Amino acid sequence: VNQNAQALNTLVKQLSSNFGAISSVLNDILSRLDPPEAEVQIDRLITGRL
Amino acid sequence: YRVVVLSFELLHAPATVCGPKKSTNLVKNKCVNFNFNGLTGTGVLTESN
């Protein structure tokens, strides 16, 4: 039960990590950058989260 | 050439400078798209305890 819960809690914590993007919050990048160039930031998070 | 650099604090605190969007009255107890000073999200708004 402890190993199941620590692995779930780590999957949740890694949503907050940057992976080298300008914010970890997807909705920050969706407010602050226009699509032609925002896609180069968001790819960091898609790859990092995957 | 005259040069200006527009530095922003994107670090979180209460709102002090803001872009020209009008505000609106707030819904509670329903699922809504919501923003507070750039805090964009989607969900149900309710009173805290």
From Swiss-Prot, chain A:
Changing residue 3 to H: In strain: Omicron/BA.1, Omicron/BA.2, Omicron/BA.2.12.1, Omicron/BA.2.75, Omicron/BA.4, Omicron/BA.5, Omicron/BQ.1.1, Omicron/XBB.1.5, Omicron/EG.5.1. It comes from the Viruses. Residues 1-42 form a coiled coil. Subunit of the fusion protein that is processed upon entry into the host cell. Mediates fusion of the virion and cellular membranes by functioning as a class I viral fusion protein. Contains a viral fusion peptide that is unmasked after S2 cleavage. This cleavage can occur at the cell membrane by host TMPRSS2 or during endocytosis by host CSTL. In either case, this triggers an extensive and irreversible conformational change that leads to fusion of the viral envelope with the cellular cytoplasmic membrane, releasing viral genomic RNA into the host cell cytoplasm. This is Spike protein S2'. It comes from Severe acute respiratory syndrome coronavirus 2 (2019-nCoV). The gene is S. The chain holds residues 952 to 1001 of 1273 of the full protein.
